[PDB]
């Protein structure tokens, strides 16, 4: 079917008016558009992409850390087993570290080398390449000019904004509400995935070369999960590169497009995607969480799925839900009902546990909290832990306060005799936040 190769939702910008036009924001967050390519974004805003060129990055912080992926240079849109015999989903990829200066040297000499090959005239086996990924641009003292340039974007796409759920978390989530950079050579691949907790993502290509993107809508993610399981792969944790002929056979639609320098790619919530560099280029990217029923729902879903799969959630959705109720006026009826429902479940579960502890003669110790204090996760199983923290007698004494969930504490100490129970929020105060959380009127 032609329906299996649909056109890319595209927007063509010419000037700042186009960029700040409110129907642009609405188009991107619309659940019917799995991806939006905003062409000419940098040119329309007069963004200086030069601030992210390799030459500029070397000057700024030449010893900055780069995560290296070593990969094979695969042909076109395919992925072959190392012997060149058959197309498979699993990708070979090995990890190491380097610096911006050292990777810059490789990026440049890579280009010079292919110029010489091009002037020499005249199934594998495949060449080996290196991809510089996940470069941390969180420090405002190291990247002042770079980060300031990105405040020129329209609000809905900024790293920080009043309408961004990740801004309301209240603390840093590295690489989600901070910027990451990528330095590439041709063939540099990002394997198949969904964003952390299904949050939207924003990506700008710095150039000078192009990237090629492959995209599948959220509601087909289960099909790809089966494919992984039938090929002995972990959908969430393994490196895989889909066989397009398999997807076509299974009637999965695939959006495919080219991202040129200055183009911005908006990946909508839960959209499955994978990417490869066509030329030599750098990219920047971060996450955003629009205030919509769709975004909140898909985020909660992935939060619960990660528990079943024993994978940590980078976004603490309990902590976030309470902050929304504390600080945000919500006027969408559907979104409001979702948050209210979740808070009620949290409150009931907490009341049940607390009464069980008291009925068994276990002391609950008032511990309170400092504000802007991040959410806590279990030091053993990495689940989010809210309000009641389980800490060993020894860790308490030393005031290291090393957090455990209730289940992990019980597994260690059958009657909790080795633990104390710390409480960060009074029940009356949580009940009030819940009771005063009501639907705001908006005529929009
Ligand atoms: Mn991504
Ligand atoms: Zn645990």
Curated annotation (Swiss-Prot):
Ranges that cross the membrane: none
Keywords in alphabetical order: Chromatin regulator, Dioxygenase, Iron, Metal-binding, Nucleus, Oxidoreductase, Phosphoprotein, Repeat, TPR repeat, Zinc
GO cellular component, one term: MLL3/4 complex
UniProt effect for mutating residue 314 to I: Significantly higher lysine demethylase activity
Record flagged with keyword Amino-acid biosynthesis: no
Positions annotated to bind Fe cation: 193, 195, 273
Gene Ontology terms describing biological process: heart development; regulation of gene expression
Modified residues (Phosphothreonine): 8
Annotated GO MF terms: chromatin DNA binding; histone demethylase activity; histone H3K27me2/H3K27me3 demethylase activity; metal ion binding; RNA polymerase II cis-regulatory region sequence-specific DNA binding
Domain JmjC: 142-305
Result after altering residue 193 to A: Abolishes lysine demethylase activity
Location(s) in or outside the cell: Nucleus
Family assignment from sequence similarity: Belongs to the UTX family.
Quaternary structure (record): Interacts with TLE1 and TLE2.
Protein's job: Male-specific histone demethylase that catalyzes trimethylated 'Lys-27' (H3K27me3) demethylation in histone H3. Has relatively low lysine demethylase activity.
Name of protein: Histone demethylase UTY
Part of the whole protein covered: 880 to 1344 of 1347
